[PDB]
Write a protein that binds this ligand. Sequence first.
Ligand code: SFQ
Length: 189
Amino acid sequence: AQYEDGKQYTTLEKPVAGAPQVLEFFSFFCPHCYQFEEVLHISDNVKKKLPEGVKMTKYHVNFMGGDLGKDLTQAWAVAMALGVEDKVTVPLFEGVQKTQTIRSASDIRDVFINAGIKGEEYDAAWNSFVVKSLVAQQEKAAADVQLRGVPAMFVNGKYQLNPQGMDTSNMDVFVQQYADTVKYLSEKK
Ligand SMILES: O=C(O)c1ccccc1NS(=O)(=O)c1ccc(I)cc1
Protein backbone atom coordinates (compact mmCIF):
# COMPACT_ATOMS: atom_id res chain seq x y z
CA ALA A 1 0.00 0.00 0.00
CA GLN A 2 0.90 3.69 -0.01
CA TYR A 3 2.62 5.03 3.11
CA GLU A 4 3.39 8.70 3.73
CA ASP A 5 4.70 10.28 6.93
CA GLY A 6 2.14 12.44 8.68
CA LYS A 7 -0.82 10.42 7.44
CA GLN A 8 -0.53 6.66 8.02
CA TYR A 9 2.56 6.84 10.21
CA THR A 10 4.67 9.47 11.92
CA THR A 11 8.40 9.32 12.59
CA LEU A 12 9.24 10.33 16.16
CA GLU A 13 11.94 12.96 16.72
CA LYS A 14 12.83 11.31 20.02
CA PRO A 15 13.68 7.66 19.19
CA VAL A 16 13.84 4.97 21.84
CA ALA A 17 17.25 3.32 21.92
CA GLY A 18 17.11 -0.41 22.55
CA ALA A 19 13.42 -0.72 21.75
CA PRO A 20 11.74 -3.91 20.41
CA GLN A 21 10.62 -4.39 16.79
CA VAL A 22 6.85 -4.26 17.31
CA LEU A 23 5.74 -2.56 20.51
CA GLU A 24 2.04 -2.30 21.29
CA PHE A 25 0.35 -0.82 24.36
CA PHE A 26 -3.04 -1.74 25.81
CA SER A 27 -5.18 -2.08 28.92
CA PHE A 28 -7.95 -4.48 29.92
CA PHE A 29 -9.76 -1.49 31.41
CA CYS A 30 -9.87 0.12 27.99
CA PRO A 31 -12.81 -0.85 25.73
CA HIS A 32 -10.83 0.73 22.90
CA CYS A 33 -8.30 -2.08 23.29
CA TYR A 34 -10.99 -4.77 23.37
CA GLN A 35 -12.21 -3.45 20.04
CA PHE A 36 -8.72 -3.60 18.55
CA GLU A 37 -8.00 -7.00 20.12
CA GLU A 38 -11.22 -8.98 19.51
CA VAL A 39 -13.22 -6.88 17.04
CA LEU A 40 -10.34 -5.93 14.74
CA HIS A 41 -7.74 -8.45 16.00
CA ILE A 42 -4.97 -5.99 15.17
CA SER A 43 -2.32 -7.82 17.19
CA ASP A 44 -3.27 -11.18 15.66
CA ASN A 45 -3.20 -9.75 12.14
CA VAL A 46 0.13 -8.01 12.72
CA LYS A 47 1.71 -11.15 14.22
CA LYS A 48 0.98 -12.99 10.96
CA LYS A 49 1.98 -10.17 8.60
CA LEU A 50 5.33 -9.70 10.33
CA PRO A 51 8.30 -11.39 8.57
CA GLU A 52 10.36 -14.13 10.21
CA GLY A 53 12.70 -12.72 12.83
CA VAL A 54 10.37 -9.98 14.05
CA LYS A 55 8.83 -10.48 17.49
CA MET A 56 5.87 -8.61 18.95
CA THR A 57 5.65 -7.01 22.38
CA LYS A 58 2.46 -6.02 24.19
CA TYR A 59 2.74 -3.74 27.24
CA HIS A 60 0.17 -2.72 29.84
CA VAL A 61 -0.20 0.98 30.73
CA ASN A 62 -0.76 2.35 34.26
CA PHE A 63 -2.74 5.46 33.32
CA MET A 64 -5.82 3.43 32.41
CA GLY A 65 -7.58 1.45 35.10
CA GLY A 66 -7.63 3.75 38.09
CA ASP A 67 -5.94 2.02 41.01
CA LEU A 68 -6.22 -1.65 40.01
CA GLY A 69 -4.74 -0.62 36.66
CA LYS A 70 -1.27 -0.95 38.18
CA ASP A 71 -1.94 -4.42 39.59
CA LEU A 72 -2.92 -5.76 36.17
CA THR A 73 0.30 -4.34 34.71
CA GLN A 74 2.24 -6.55 37.12
CA ALA A 75 0.02 -9.54 36.38
CA TRP A 76 0.50 -9.05 32.64
CA ALA A 77 4.26 -9.17 33.14
CA VAL A 78 3.90 -12.57 34.81
CA ALA A 79 1.77 -13.81 31.91
CA MET A 80 4.50 -12.74 29.51
CA ALA A 81 7.15 -14.61 31.50
CA LEU A 82 5.05 -17.78 31.74
CA GLY A 83 3.98 -17.54 28.12
CA VAL A 84 0.23 -17.58 28.74
CA GLU A 85 -0.43 -13.99 27.71
CA ASP A 86 -2.66 -14.89 24.75
CA LYS A 87 -4.46 -17.50 26.83
CA VAL A 88 -5.31 -14.99 29.56
CA THR A 89 -5.98 -12.07 27.18
CA VAL A 90 -9.61 -13.10 26.59
CA PRO A 91 -10.66 -14.03 30.21
CA LEU A 92 -8.96 -10.91 31.57
CA PHE A 93 -10.72 -8.62 29.09
CA GLU A 94 -14.07 -10.30 29.73
CA GLY A 95 -13.65 -10.38 33.51
CA VAL A 96 -12.92 -6.65 33.52
CA GLN A 97 -15.29 -5.21 30.89
CA LYS A 98 -18.00 -7.84 30.40
CA THR A 99 -18.40 -9.59 33.75
CA GLN A 100 -16.41 -6.95 35.63
CA THR A 101 -15.75 -9.58 38.29
CA ILE A 102 -12.06 -8.69 38.49
CA ARG A 103 -11.97 -5.96 41.13
CA SER A 104 -8.96 -6.91 43.24
CA ALA A 105 -5.53 -8.42 42.54
CA SER A 106 -6.83 -11.57 44.20
CA ASP A 107 -9.33 -11.83 41.34
CA ILE A 108 -6.54 -11.61 38.77
CA ARG A 109 -4.55 -14.29 40.60
CA ASP A 110 -7.59 -16.58 40.35
CA VAL A 111 -7.68 -16.22 36.56
CA PHE A 112 -4.12 -17.53 36.24
CA ILE A 113 -4.89 -20.43 38.57
CA ASN A 114 -7.93 -21.31 36.45
CA ALA A 115 -5.82 -21.17 33.28
CA GLY A 116 -3.51 -23.80 34.71
CA ILE A 117 -0.91 -21.79 36.59
CA LYS A 118 -0.28 -22.97 40.14
CA GLY A 119 -0.89 -20.34 42.80
CA GLU A 120 2.50 -20.99 44.37
CA GLU A 121 4.27 -20.60 41.02
CA TYR A 122 2.28 -17.48 40.20
CA ASP A 123 2.78 -15.94 43.65
CA ALA A 124 6.49 -16.72 43.44
CA ALA A 125 6.66 -14.82 40.16
CA TRP A 126 4.42 -12.07 41.57
CA ASN A 127 7.16 -11.42 44.11
CA SER A 128 9.98 -11.84 41.59
CA PHE A 129 12.42 -9.08 40.65
CA VAL A 130 12.20 -10.13 37.00
CA VAL A 131 8.53 -9.14 36.92
CA LYS A 132 9.19 -5.91 38.84
CA SER A 133 11.72 -4.75 36.25
CA LEU A 134 9.24 -5.67 33.50
CA VAL A 135 6.60 -3.41 35.04
CA ALA A 136 9.06 -0.53 35.17
CA GLN A 137 10.00 -1.04 31.51
CA GLN A 138 6.33 -1.17 30.47
CA GLU A 139 5.56 2.32 31.76
CA LYS A 140 9.06 3.60 30.91
CA ALA A 141 8.54 2.74 27.24
CA ALA A 142 5.18 4.51 27.18
CA ALA A 143 6.69 7.59 28.83
CA ASP A 144 9.56 7.58 26.33
CA VAL A 145 7.34 7.36 23.24
CA GLN A 146 4.99 9.96 24.74
CA LEU A 147 2.03 7.58 24.66
CA ARG A 148 -1.15 9.58 24.06
CA GLY A 149 -3.67 6.82 23.50
CA VAL A 150 -4.00 3.42 25.14
CA PRO A 151 -4.01 1.23 21.95
CA ALA A 152 -0.98 2.25 19.91
CA MET A 153 1.79 0.50 18.01
CA PHE A 154 5.39 1.63 17.65
CA VAL A 155 7.85 0.07 15.23
CA ASN A 156 11.48 -0.16 16.38
CA GLY A 157 10.74 2.74 18.72
CA LYS A 158 11.13 5.09 15.75
CA TYR A 159 7.98 4.97 13.66
CA GLN A 160 4.61 5.67 15.25
CA LEU A 161 1.35 4.53 13.65
CA ASN A 162 -1.59 6.90 13.27
CA PRO A 163 -5.08 5.31 13.04
CA GLN A 164 -6.66 8.72 12.43
CA GLY A 165 -4.77 8.93 9.16
CA MET A 166 -6.07 5.71 7.66
CA ASP A 167 -9.31 4.51 6.08
CA THR A 168 -12.21 4.95 8.46
CA SER A 169 -14.89 3.80 6.04
CA ASN A 170 -14.29 0.05 5.91
CA MET A 171 -13.21 -1.97 8.95
CA ASP A 172 -11.60 -4.59 6.70
CA VAL A 173 -9.37 -2.01 5.05
CA PHE A 174 -8.44 -0.35 8.36
CA VAL A 175 -7.32 -3.65 9.90
CA GLN A 176 -5.30 -4.64 6.82
CA GLN A 177 -3.89 -1.16 6.25
CA TYR A 178 -2.78 -0.88 9.88
CA ALA A 179 -0.96 -4.21 9.81
CA ASP A 180 0.46 -3.36 6.38
CA THR A 181 1.90 -0.13 7.72
CA VAL A 182 3.49 -1.97 10.66
CA LYS A 183 5.17 -4.47 8.35
CA TYR A 184 6.41 -1.70 6.06
CA LEU A 185 7.98 0.11 9.00
CA SER A 186 9.47 -3.14 10.31
CA GLU A 187 11.10 -3.79 6.94
CA LYS A 188 12.20 -0.15 6.83
CA LYS A 189 14.61 0.81 9.61
O1 SFQ B 1 -12.13 3.94 17.93
C1 SFQ B 1 -11.39 4.87 17.53
O2 SFQ B 1 -11.15 5.83 18.29
C2 SFQ B 1 -10.87 4.86 16.24
C3 SFQ B 1 -10.10 5.93 15.80
C4 SFQ B 1 -9.60 5.94 14.50
C5 SFQ B 1 -9.87 4.88 13.64
C6 SFQ B 1 -10.64 3.81 14.08
C7 SFQ B 1 -11.14 3.80 15.38
N1 SFQ B 1 -11.87 2.80 15.86
S1 SFQ B 1 -12.20 1.56 14.84
O3 SFQ B 1 -10.91 1.07 14.18
O4 SFQ B 1 -12.82 0.41 15.64
C8 SFQ B 1 -13.34 2.09 13.63
C9 SFQ B 1 -13.01 2.05 12.28
C10 SFQ B 1 -13.92 2.48 11.33
C11 SFQ B 1 -15.18 2.93 11.72
I1 SFQ B 1 -16.56 3.57 10.28
C12 SFQ B 1 -15.51 2.97 13.06
C13 SFQ B 1 -14.60 2.55 14.02
